[PDB]
C-alpha cells in the first residue's frame, strides 16, 4: 500500500502471536536478559527456523563461544547446524578474541551478500565494549544503522545484572534499537520463572507485559495468556462420572467439554471420585491421565484396589497413565507445559488433577489462577472432560467452596463435607451447581466401603447441615 510494517515469522512457539507477525524486517531487534535467560537460544532458533521453514540463509556472529561450541550446544535441541553450514544455508562468523566496529561491519557484510542471508544474529554486542555510556550509544547506533541499509533483519543479544534493573547493561541500547525483547529468569521463593516481554515495536502493534515460557528439547515454548482465546467448542453430550448416583444427581452424567471440581475437607472422598472417574474412561476403551500431586503411584494403586478398582490393569492396557510429581519440585509454568505435553502424546479423553489445592501452595493467588486458566482453557479447547480436586483448609467451616476463588472458572461443583450426627462423623455429597443441565439440589448422605461410594438419602429432619454440626 503501504499501511503497516511487514513482519518475519520466527516460528518460535507463541512469539509470532505476541509480536502479531514476528520481527520487523530490515530492522534490528534487541533481546536482553540476565545469564541463562535463553538469549543465545532465541538467536539460534531465529536462524535455524528461518532456514528449515523458508530457506532464508542466516548469519550467526559469536564473540565468546566457538563455532564448534555453538553447534555442540544446538545438539541438545536436536537440530543439525553443521549440515546447514555445509549446505551454505548458515554461516557462523567467529568474531571472538583468543589467548574496531569497522572490521566487524565488513565481515558481517561480506558473509551476508555471500550467502544471500536474509536473517542475522549477533551475540553479544555488550562483551565488545568490555567504556563510557556515551561511547556505547555511538558504537551501537553505528552497527544498527549500517545493518539497516543492507535490508537484513538482525537479532542483537544484550546482557543484564538485575531481573528488574535497567533493560540493558548501559541503559542506552534500548533507545538505539527499534524493537526490544526482555527475557527474565525471576526467582519466586526458590523456583525460577521464565518470562518473555516485547517492550516496544517501533511501527507495528504487539502484546504488552510478560508472558510465561519454558526451555525444553524443542527450544523456547511461549504461552500467549489470552491469544485468543474464550472461543472453545461446547457440545450438549454427556459422559459418566464413574458413579451411577452422581450421574443422576447431575441430570444423567457429567458433560463432554466441561471442568468439574470436587471440593471438601481432608478425607471426604475426593481421590475416590477421581479413581471412579478415571476408571470409567478405561471401562469404555478410552484413555485417561491422572495427574497425582500428593500420593505415590504405589499408594494410589493400593487405595484404588481397596475400592475394587485395578489401576495396574488399565495401565497394562495403555488406557490409564498416572503422572505423579511434587508441586514444589517445579514452577507453575513447568507443570502446565508437562500437562500439555502429556495430553498431546497420550491423547486422552478424560483428565484429572489430584489436587489443585496442592499446586496452589507457597505460590501467589495470581500465579495459581493463571495456571488454572491454562489447564482448564487447554482442556476445553480439546474437549477433554477434566475433573479437578480442591482440599478445604477449614473442615466444617462453610463460607466459600475454594479459598483460591476458582468457582467461576469451573462449570460443575461436587461439594463433599463432614457432618457430626449422633457423636459420629458422617459425610454428605452435593452437586453445588451444574452449568447447562438440571442437577439434584439435595445434601445426600453417602458412605465409603470396599465397593466404592454408596450415596444414601439427604438429612430431611436436620437444619444447619452446611455448618458441619446440625
Ligand X SMILES: Nc1ncnc2c1ncn2[C@@H]1O[C@H](COP(=O)(O)OP(=O)(O)OP(=O)(O)O)[C@@H](O)[C@H]1O
**Residue stretches of the annotated binding site for ATP:** 36-41, 76, 200-202, 204, 206, 216-217, 266-272, 307, 427, 433-435, 437, 439, 441
In angstroms, what CA-CA distances link 330 with 189, 299, 353, 438? 12, 22, 16, 40
Count Cβ atoms below 10 Å from residue 277 Cβ, excluding itself: 27
Closest-CA residue to 117 (of 146, 155, 89): 89
Q: Does 33 bind ligand X (CB under 6 A)?
A: yes
Residues paired with 184 in a beta bridge: 195
Nearer residue to a copy of itself within complex by CB, 227 or 244: 227
The C-alpha atoms of residue 275 and residue 255 are separated, in whole angstroms, by 18
- Binds ligand X (CB under 6 A): choice among 32, 271, 390, 392: 271
Q: How many residues in the shown chain lie near a copy of itself by CB under 8 A?
A: 169
Verify cis geometry, omega within 30 degrees of 0, for the bond prior to 2. Answer: yes
Please confirm, yes or no, whether 294 is among the known catalytic residues.
yes
Q: Does 380 bind ligand X (CB under 6 A)?
A: no
Rounded to the nearest whole angstrom, what is the least distance from the CB of residue 400 to Mg ion in the complex?
A: 16
Do 388 and 402 touch, CB atoms closer than 8 A? no
Closest-CA residue to 335 (of 93, 55, 343): 343
- List strand residue ranges (DSSP E) for 170-271, in order: 179-187, 192-201, 210-216, 219-222, 259-264
Closest-CA residue to 116 (of 51, 42, 49, 30): 51
Nearer residue to a copy of itself within complex by CB, 99 or 100: 99
Which cell numbers in the block locate residue 125? 554486542
Nearer residue to ligand X within complex by CB, 109 or 204: 204
User: Annotated binding site for Mg(2+), which residues?
Assistant: 40, 271, 294
Binding mask 201-240 for a copy of itself (x = CB under 8 A): xxxxx--xxx----x-x-------xxxxxxxxxxxx----
Q: Does 448 bind ligand X (CB under 6 A)?
A: yes
Which cell numbers in the block locate residue 180? 526490544
Q: For cell 474412561, name the residue.
A: 281
Q: Does 310 bind a copy of itself (CB under 8 A)?
A: no
The C-alpha atoms of residue 312 and residue 307 are separated, in whole angstroms, by 14
What is the b/e burial string over 372-391, where b = at least 16 CB atoms within 10 angstroms of the residue's CB?
A: bbbbbbbbbebebbbbbbbb
Q: Does 151 bind a copy of itself (CB under 8 A)?
A: no
Binding mask 200-239 for ligand X (x = CB under 6 A): xxxxxxx--------xxx----------------------
Which cell numbers in the block locate residue 120? 542475522
Segment interacting with ligand X, rule: CB under 6 A, options 87-95, 140-148, 312-320, 433-441: 433-441
Residue 237 contact, options a copy of itself, Mg ion, ligand X, none, Cβ 5-8 Å cut-off depending on partner type: none
| Pairing between β-strand 192-201 and β-strand 179-187 as defined by DSSP bridges | antiparallel
Residue 109 contact, options Mg ion, a copy of itself, ligand X, none, Cβ 5-8 Å cut-off depending on partner type: none
Do 268 and 418 touch, CB atoms closer than 8 A? yes
What DSSP element (H or E) covers 293? none
Rounded to the nearest whole angstrom, what is the least distance from the CB of residue 340 to a copy of itself in the complex?
A: 17
Q: Does 344 bind ligand X (CB under 6 A)?
A: no
Rounded to the nearest whole angstrom, what is the least distance from the CB of residue 153 to a copy of itself in the complex?
A: 14
Rounded to the nearest whole angstrom, what is the least distance from the CB of residue 136 to ligand X in the complex?
A: 15
Of residues 53, 64, 87, 313, which has the active-site annotation?
64
Q: Does 331 bind a copy of itself (CB under 8 A)?
A: yes
Please confirm, yes or no, whether 64 is among the known catalytic residues.
yes
Segment interacting with ligand X, rule: CB under 6 A, options 141-149, 311-319, 341-349, 427-435: 427-435
User: How far from the centroid of its chain's Cα atoms is residue 38's Cα?
Assistant: 16
The C-alpha atoms of residue 444 and residue 442 are separated, in whole angstroms, by 6
- Binds a copy of itself (CB under 8 A): choice among 17, 52, 166, 218: 166
Cβ partners under 8 Å of residue 31, min gap 6: 39, 42, 43, 155, 156, 157, 158, 181, 183
Of residues 65, 197, 294, 445, which has the active-site annotation?
294
Binding residues for Mg ion, rule: CB under 5 A, are 39-40, 123, 271, 294
Residues serving a catalytic function are 64, 294
Residues of this chain that bind ligand X (CB under 6 A):
33, 35-41, 76-77, 159, 174-175, 200-206, 215-217, 264, 266-272, 294, 306, 391, 407-408, 433-439, 448-450
Amino acid at each position: 500500500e503501504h499501511q503497516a510494517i511487514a513482519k518475519m515469522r520466527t516460528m518460535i512457539e507463541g512469539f509470532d502471536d505476541i509480536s502479531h507477525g514476528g520481527l520487523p524486517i530490515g530492522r534490528s531487534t534487541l533481546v536482553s536478559g540476565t545469564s541463562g535467560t535463553g538469549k543465545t537460544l532465541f538467536s539460534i532458533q531465529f536462524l535455524y527456523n528461518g532456514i528449515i521453514e523458508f530457506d532464508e540463509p542466516g548469519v550467526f556472529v559469536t564473540f565468546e563461544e566457538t563455532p564448534q561450541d555453538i553447534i555442540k550446544n544446538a545438539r541438545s535441541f536436536g537440530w543439525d547446524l553443521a549440515k546447514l553450514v555445509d549446505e551454505g544455508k548458515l554461516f557462523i562468523l567467529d568474531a571472538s578474541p583468543d589467548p574496531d566496529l569497522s572490521a566487524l561491519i565488513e565481515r558481517i557484510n561480506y558473509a551476508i551478500q555471500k550467502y544471500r542471508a536474509r536473517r542475522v544474529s549477533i551475540d553479544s554486542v555488550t562483551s565488545v565494549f568490555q567504556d563510557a555510556s556515551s561511547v556505547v550509544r555511538r558504537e551501537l547506533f553505528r552497527l544498527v544503522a549500517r545493518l539497516k541499509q543492507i535490508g537484513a533483519t538482525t537479532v542483537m543479544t544484550t546482557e543484564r545484572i538485575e531481573e528488574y534493573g535497567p533493560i540493558a547493561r548501559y541503559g542506552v541500547e534500548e533507545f538505539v534499537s527499534d524493537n526490544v525483547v526482555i527475557l527474565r529468569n525471576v526467582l519466586e521463593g526458590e523456583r525460577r520463572r521464565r518470562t518473555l516481554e516485547i517492550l516496544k515495536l517501533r511501527g507495528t502493534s504487539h502484546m504488552k507485559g510478560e508472558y510465561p515460557f519454558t526451555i525444553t528439547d524443542h527450544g523456547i515454548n511461549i504461552f500467549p495468556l489470552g491469544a485468543m482465546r474464550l472461543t472453545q467448542r461446547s457440545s450438549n453430550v454427556r459422559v459418566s462420572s464413574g458413579v451411577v448416583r452422581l450421574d443422576e444427581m447431575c441430570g444423567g452424567g457429567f458433560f463432554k467439554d466441561s471442568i468439574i471440581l470436587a471440593t471438601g475437607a481432608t478425607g471426604t472422598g475426593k481421590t475416590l471420585l477421581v479413581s471412579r472417574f478415571v476408571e470409567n474412561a478405561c471401562a469404555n476403551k478410552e484413555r485417561a491421565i491422572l495427574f497425582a500431586y500428593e500420593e505415590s503411584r504405589a499408594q494410589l494403586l493400593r487405595n484404588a484396589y481397596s475400592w475394587g478398582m485395578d489401576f495396574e490393569e488399565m495401565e497394562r492396557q495403555n488406557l490409564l497413565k498416572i503422572v505423579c510429581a511434587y508441586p514444589e519440585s517445579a514452577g507453575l509454568e513447568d507443570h502446565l507445559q508437562i500437562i500439555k505435553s502429556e495430553i498431546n502424546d497420550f491423547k486422552p479423553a478424560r483428565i484429572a488433577i489430584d489436587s489443585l489445592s496442592a499446586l496452589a501452595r507457597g505460590v501467589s493467588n495470581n500465579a495459581f489462577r493463571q495456571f488454572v486458566i491454562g489447564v482448564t482453557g487447554y482442556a476445553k479447547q480439546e474437549e477433554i472432560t477434566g475433573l479437578f480436586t480442591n482440599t478445604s483448609d477449614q473442615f466444617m467451616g462453610a463460607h466459600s467452596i475454594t479459598d483460591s476463588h476458582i468457582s467461576t472458572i469451573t462449570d460443575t461443583i461436587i461439594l463433599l463435607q463432614y457432618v457430626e450426627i449422633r457423636g459420629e462423623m458422617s459425610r454428605a455429597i452435593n452437586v453445588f451447581k451444574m452449568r447447562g443441565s438440571w442437577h439434584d439440589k439435595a445434601i445426600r448422605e453417602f458412605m465409603i466401603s470396599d465397593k466404592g461410594p454408596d450415596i444414601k438419602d439427604s438429612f430431611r429432619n436436620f437444619e444447619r447441615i452446611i455448618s458441619g454440626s446440625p
